[PDB]
Amino acid sequence: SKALLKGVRDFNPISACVCLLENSSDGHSERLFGIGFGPYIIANQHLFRRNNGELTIKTMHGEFAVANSTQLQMKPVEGRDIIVIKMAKDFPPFPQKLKFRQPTIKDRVCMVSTNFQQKSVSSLVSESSHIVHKEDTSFWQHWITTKDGQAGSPLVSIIDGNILGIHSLTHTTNGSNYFVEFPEKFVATYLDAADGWCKNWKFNADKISWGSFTLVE
């Protein structure tokens, strides 16, 4: 019968669009997740904390060593830890069916990821979590266990399966976790829109809204 907790849900279409992102430089490798959508990769801005890394993108449909990331057109969601990267024409695109929306206080979320195997990928899903908005920011708190490496993993509503955000932050001592929410009309405004792209974008933490957080970088 109907009960407190939601029943079985299919997260596989989300998992099919999750990518591994490696930004490699002399003496440092940034390893995060991303979300593919058409010719676009959606990632954290902090993937590009370090300039001029060689970017490798692993997907269910191939592995793409795009090399120097500074040549790529990018579109930041200004004020929050999300960036959209446009791939070259020779990068085979993802489908364009995922739904994105802002979270609400009705939502609970599961983290979704992917494992890469020889002939296939497999889907991974976490326990569901309550969420709490961090005032004057795009950050929402969640309680799902994460390791360094899991930034960029989608947080998915168990109400309607929409992607609400991607993992971003952890507290430096108490282990609290935070994801960054997608804005309203994200696909229409950032993906479908022909304008607003550039190659000369550089990461600046000061351009993200922090509210009462102090970022330790």
Add this chain to the structure above:
Amino acid sequence: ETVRFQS
């Protein structure tokens, strides 16, 4: 308070 990118 004090936070870091999880990367």
